[PDB]
Structures are given as structure tokens and as C-alpha cells.
Amino acid sequence: MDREALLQAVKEARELAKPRNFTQSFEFIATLKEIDMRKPENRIKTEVVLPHGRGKEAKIAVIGTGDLAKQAEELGLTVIRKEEIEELGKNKRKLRKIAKAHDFFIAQADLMPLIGRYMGVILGPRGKMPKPVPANANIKPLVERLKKTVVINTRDKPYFQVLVGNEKMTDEQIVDNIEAVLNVVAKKYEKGLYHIKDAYVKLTMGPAVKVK
Numbered sequence: 001m002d003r004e005a006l007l008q009a010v011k012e013a014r015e016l017a018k019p020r021n022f023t024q025s026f027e028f029i030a031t032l033k034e035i036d037m038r039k040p041e042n043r044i045k046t047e048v049v050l051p052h053g054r055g056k057e058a059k060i061a062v063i064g065t066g067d068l069a070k071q072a073e074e075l076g077l078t079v080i081r082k083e084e085i086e087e088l089g090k091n092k093r094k095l096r097k098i099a100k101a102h103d104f105f106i107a108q109a110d111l112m113p114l115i116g117r118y119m120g121v122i123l124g125p126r127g128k129m130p131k132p133v134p135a136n137a138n139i140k141p142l143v144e145r146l147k148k149t150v151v152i153n154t155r156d157k158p159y160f161q162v163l164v165g166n167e168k169m170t171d172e173q174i175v176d177n178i179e180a181v182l183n184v185v186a187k188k189y190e191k192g193l194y195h196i197k198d199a200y201v202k203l204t205m206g207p208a209v210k211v212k
Contacts, residue, residue, distance in 0.1 A: 001193060005212040006178055009201040010171040017206025024204035025055060025166045028178050031159040033197035035189065044154045046184050048162075049145045052173035055166025057147040059101060062139070063115055063130055064108035071139050078102060082111060089118030096122055104146045105130035106139060127153075152184055158197075167203060174201075 010026065017024065035042050062072035063080040072079045078098070080088065088095040099122050107115055107130030115123075115130060123129045133139060154160045164177040178201070186192040199211040 001196070001199075001212060003175055003179070006175045006201075007171055009199075009209050009211040010174045010178075013201040013203055013206055013209040014167065014171070016209060017203040020205055022204075023055070023166050023168055024206065026164050026169075026174050027161050027202050027204070028164045028181055029159065029161045029200040029202065029208060030182075030185070031197040031199075032154070032185075032195045033158070034191075035158055035195050037154065037156045037158050042189075043156060044152050044160060044184065044188060046152050046188075047149050048152055048180055048184055050148050050150055050164065050177040051180055052165060052169060052177055053148040054150055054163050055169055058103035058149055060104045060106060060143055060146050061098065061102040062106045063111060063119075064106075064135065065111075066108075066135060068108050068133070068135055068137065068139065072106075075140065075143050077143065082108075082114070085111070085114050085118050092122060095119060099123055099126050099128055102128070104128070104149065106142065106146075107132055108135045109133060110135060127151075150181075152181060164201075 013026065037043055061078040061080060062068060063085065065082045069079050069081060105123065105128055109132040112132050120129060133142065150163045152160050152162050162181055164181060165174045182193060185196060189195050200208040201211065202208040
């Protein structure tokens with residue numbers, strides 16, 4: 001459970017994976033013990049800002065107007081103006097395309113009702129409803145964090161698998177990222193990491209390697 005054991009797991013996952021014509025990602029898998037997932041409070045659905053990022057930044061879309069839209073343009077983000085909300089609702093094909101092309105959505109708070117009404121049917125089931133922010137909010141800090149954010153989601157099962165980086169990053173960075181993921185479990189349960197039954201590290205198409 002210590003850093004050295006994590007470092008060894010990352011190393012092995014990396015070495016045991018047959019090379020491929022694409023940058024593989026490291027996935028961290030953890031099974032949980034003595035946690036009753038029938039109780040909604042025990043489930044995990046928390047965002048985690050990875051210290052060294054996901055390897056490739058997460059794609060963010062901003063739904064809004066005024067200066068929120070301007071900031072989104074300045075940050076090089078996809079912008080969906082208020083008028084486009086209903087247009088997207090009529091073009092579900094395009095909306096699904098946009099949903100699939102982005103990891104997170106940010107939206108002007110006063111537009112959430114409209115967004116839920118026309119875009120929610122697509123974003124909701126995909127866990128991509130927007131994080132609301134005041135229309136006068138400075139979104140750079142939020143965008144910075146989201147670009148390096150991954151989501152731990154157990155649903156109603158005693159385990160989770162989450163992205164922790166890619167092979168272009170160093171093993172040290174991957175372990176730092178994994179530690180950030182583990183800190184979530186540490187803070188959620190009273191006994192913390194005592195609940196980790198088994199942990200594994202694997203590359204996209206490589207074998208899962210058990211930690212320690």
C-alpha cells in the first residue's frame with residue numbers, strides 16, 4: 001500500500017503490456033471490502049484533480065453568454081451560446097457528438113433550467129450535465145482544475161476503475177496521481193484505505209497488475 005509497492009505495480013503494468021501504435025493510458029482499479037453498496041451514502045461519485053493530469057487534458061465545453069462565453073473563447077474552449085441550446089435540442093445527433101467530444105460542461109447558472117429542458121435528455125444519462133457557475137464568475141481556476149480532473153464512480157458496485165495518466169508520463173507522476181485517487185477513499189470512509197481489498201494498475205491494453 002506504500003509508494004514503493006505502487007511504483008513497482010506501475011513499472012510492471014508498463015513492462016508487461018505489449019507495445020502498440022497508440023499512447024496507452026494507465027487505469028487504477030480498486031476493489032472494496034466491508035462496504036455495503038446498497039446504501040447510497042457508501043457509493044462514490046467524486047471528482048479528483050490529478051496532480052500531474054490525465055496525460056491528455058480533459059475537454060471542457062462552456063454553455064453561456066456574455067463574459068462567460070468570452071472567457072471560454074479566451075481559454076480556447078468549446079462555447080455553446082444560449083441561442084444554441086434549443087438548436088442542439090433539435091439536433092440530437094450533433095448534441096450526442098458534442099457530448100461524446102467533451103468530458104465536462106460548465107454552464108451559466110441562470111441557464112440550467114433551459115439546458116436541462118433541451119439538452120438534459122442527452123447530457124444527463126451520460127453524467128455530463130454542466131457544473132453551474134454565477135454569470136459573473138471567473139472560470140479560469142475551475143477550467144484549470146477540470147482539465148486535470150477524473151471521476152471516481154463506483155455506482156452500486158464495490159469497486160472502481162479510474163484513469164490516472166498515460167505512458168508518456170513518469171511512474172512517479174502516475175503514483176502521485178494514484179495517491180490522489182486513494183485520498184478520496186481515505187476521506188470517505190471512517191476506516192479509510194482499510195476498505196481497499198485489492199488494487200491494480202494496468203495500461204489500456206495491458207494486463208492488470210496487483211499492487212503489493
